[PDB]
Design a protein around this ligand. Structure first.
Ligand SMILES: [Zn+2]
Ligand SMILES: [Zn+2]
Ligand SMILES: [Zn+2]
Lengths: 467, 119, 88
């Protein structure tokens, strides 16, 4: 009776207070509220829904506060998500005694406001969050820290599009393995174990193949140096996401090594050759004709362009094209990179804004505080095009996986309806992503065209499998 | 006889228009009008046969014909042709019974979506 | 007019079987070109998906060709063992 008189008759007022207690952090008041309301039968649903709505609104406001900056700054987005998530997790653990309903509501709200936000609307796609998470992971891994990794892992399970994150992480791991700039192998091993716990065995086996290729390359390099400064890495084309390079002319000074190693491979392996990549190849060169001795770290294209100035004086862009054989866009980007650093320069402010046409040059001053200098920088517009290509590959792979899943489903069941194939396809791929019906439908017509499925004459809504 | 050939046209024109046999004729038209070297019928040829065969029977033949000209600049597959007649048979003036998640090709549903606002 | 010398060089190369990289084993057409059945029919939605398919044995084949081969036989033609898709 008393609980009815004291608590039940004023519950509405309690609700009016609840939102207020959510505006100003008062853990003790919330705990007292939960303890008193817990006596009332099925009286916690309104509190649960109010808490979920408040969490969603606060998360949306926090994401919108840092708009226009989190698009190219993943770290800010991850930190904004993580602080809110940890604050509400601590609040649920303390005030609400880790109730199942409260944690379920928190998970629902987090899944709601993580996939969709102002950043998602600006990017016009829901795949931006996994890309930002992968970028943050790569930045953390590339050159006390396991807590952040665990936080990222516990946040990642709320992502409904895991294929994009997996592909981006694999690509970044391949890039970090090709160039030897890693903070520690122990962190990589811990990340591999965490992904093994989270993801499947095949995804980690791909990375294990990558590590095995790296080890084989190291062993081949040590065998080469025993047989004989030149360092090369040999990787399988079918287990790495790199693409073939464009046409390029090998510099004469670098020819000597090229003939020596290749024949060695022909001595060790018969029936295979090597397709050299130049965009991912870098080196160091030394110049002694300046005021002070200098050493510069450059790429293959930059080194070739520089070695074209040895023995000549001013060149014009038509020449640098017909001798080195570099495409107009790549050559223009490399020339712009070289310019923005004062090494090849009629004195123009808009080096950033310049239009380059075939007309022009080494500038012999070039002082700098540091003895050794890194002029290798990422291209201006390579990242955006790479992201678009990765996204397109993701969509094509999604279509291929749906086309293969339908085929493998239509072999256990000779005949199947149209409302039982779609549910099976959705539930089979639900671990990775949720395909849309028109995407699943567009694959069915392709399979029927390729003589994989047949519509029975008597019923247009029931497919069958033919050999 | 020559008189038999002359009199053939009225009777089998009358008989072919009945359902069932007309289904077989419509199915046979795809293979008859298609070159053996290509599985897909050309756009212009398909439009010509749509005009010739479905004259008057299709309620929205004039509207359907103007489609797939500035948008679908590709050949027509065999499955769309087979289901076009069923779609025409089942369709109504209001076009409110159509379903976007059914067993219809991606062309029929997009045509329905395009033609929905204008009515 | 300047003097430049290189101290070290780092290069990355990819290895593949030369017997099949130039042209597919199933069809003698170029690997970068369209397949045999994708050339006769060139106005369909199946002609915009003919790409390269790779396996564990680093064997490159056309996706349609390997898919058709894996409809009655489950072995890679050149090495005679189970074929598993690796990348597209
Ligand atoms: Zn093909
Ligand atoms: Zn082929
Ligand atoms: Zn093989």
């Amino acid at each position: 009776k008393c609980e009815q008189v004291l608590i039940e008759k004023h519950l509405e007022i309690f609700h009016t207070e609840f939102q207020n207690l959510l505006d100003a952090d008062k853990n003790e008041d919330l705990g007292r509220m939960y303890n008193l309301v817990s006596r009332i039968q099925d009286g916690l649903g309104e509190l649960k829904k109010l808490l979920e709505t408040h969490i969603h609104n606060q998360g949306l406001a926090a994401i919108e506060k840092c708009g226009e900056a989190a698009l190219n700054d993943p770290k800010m987005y991850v930190q904004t998500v993580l602080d809110v998530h940890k604050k509400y997790n601590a609040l649920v653990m303390s005030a609400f005694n880790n109730d199942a309903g409260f944690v379920a509501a928190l998970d629902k709200a987090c899944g709601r406001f993580i996939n969709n936000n102002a950043v998602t609307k600006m990017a016009q796609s829901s795949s931006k969050s996994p890309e930002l998470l992968a970028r943050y992971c790569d930045s953390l891994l590339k050159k006390e820290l396991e807590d952040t990794l665990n936080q990222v892992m516990v946040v990642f399970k709320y992502i409904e599009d895991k294929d994009v994150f997996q592909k981006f992480y694999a690509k970044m791991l391949a890039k970090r393995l090709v160039h030897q700039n890693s903070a520690s192998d122990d962190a990589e091993a811990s990340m591999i174990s965490k992904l093994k716990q989270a993801c499947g065995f095949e995804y980690t086996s791909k990375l294990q193949r990558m590590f095995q290729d790296i080890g084989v390359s190291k062993d081949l390099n040590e065998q080469f140096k025993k047989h004989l400064d030149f360092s090369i890495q040999v990787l399988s084309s079918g287990s790495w996401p790199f693409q073939q390079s464009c046409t390029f002319a090998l510099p004469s000074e670098l020819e000597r090594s090229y003939q020596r190693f290749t024949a060695f491979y022909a001595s060790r392996h018969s029936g295979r050759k090597l397709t050299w990549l130049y965009q991912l190849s870098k080196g160091e060169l030394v110049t002694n004709c300046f005021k002070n001795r200098y050493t510069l770290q450059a790429s293959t294209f930059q080194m070739a362009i520089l070695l074209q100035y040895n023995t000549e004086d001013a060149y014009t862009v038509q020449q640098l094209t017909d001798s080195t054989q570099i495409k107009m866009d790549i050559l223009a980007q490399v020339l712009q990179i070289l310019l923005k650093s004062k090494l090849l320069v009629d004195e123009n402010a808009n080096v950033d804004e310049v239009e380059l046409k075939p007309d022009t040059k080494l500038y012999l001053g070039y002082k700098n505080k540091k003895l050794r200098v890194n002029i290798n920088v990422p291209m201006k517009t390579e990242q955006k095009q790479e992201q678009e290509t990765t996204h397109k590959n993701i969509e094509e792979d999604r279509k291929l996986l749906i086309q293969a899943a339908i085929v493998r489903i239509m072999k256990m069941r000779k005949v199947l309806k149209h409302q039982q194939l779609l549910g099976e396809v959705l539930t089979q791929l639900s671990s990775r992503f949720k395909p849309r019906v028109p995407v699943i439908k567009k694959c069915i017509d392709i399979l029927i065209e390729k003589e994989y499925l047949e519509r029975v004459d008597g019923e247009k809504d029931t497919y069958s499998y033919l050999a | 006889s020559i008189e038999k050939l002359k009199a053939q046209i009225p009777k089998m024109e009358q008989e072919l228009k009945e359902p069932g046999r007309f289904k077989d004729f419509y199915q046979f038209t795809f293979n008859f009008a298609k070159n053996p070297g290509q599985k897909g019928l050309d756009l212009e040829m398909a439009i010509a046969y749509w005009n010739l065969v479905l004259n008057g029977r299709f309620k929205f033949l004039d509207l359907w014909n103007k489609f797939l000209l500035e948008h679908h600049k590709r050949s027509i597959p065999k499955d769309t042709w087979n289901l076009l007649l069923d779609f025409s048979t089942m369709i109504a003036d209001d076009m409110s019974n159509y379903d976007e998640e059914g067993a219809w090709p991606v062309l029929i549903d997009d045509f329905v979506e395009f033609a929905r606002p204008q009515i | 007019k300047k003097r430049f010398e290189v101290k070290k060089w780092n290069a990355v190369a990819l290895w593949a079987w030369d017997i099949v990289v130039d042209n597919c084993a199933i069809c003698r057409n170029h690997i970068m070109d369209l397949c045999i059945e994708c050339q006769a029919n060139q106005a369909s939605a199946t002609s915009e998906e003919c790409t390269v398919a790779w396996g564990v044995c680093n064997h490159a084949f056309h996706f349609h060709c390997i898919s058709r081969w894996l409809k009655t036989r489950q072995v890679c033609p050149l090495d005679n063992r189970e074929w598993e898709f690796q990348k597209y």
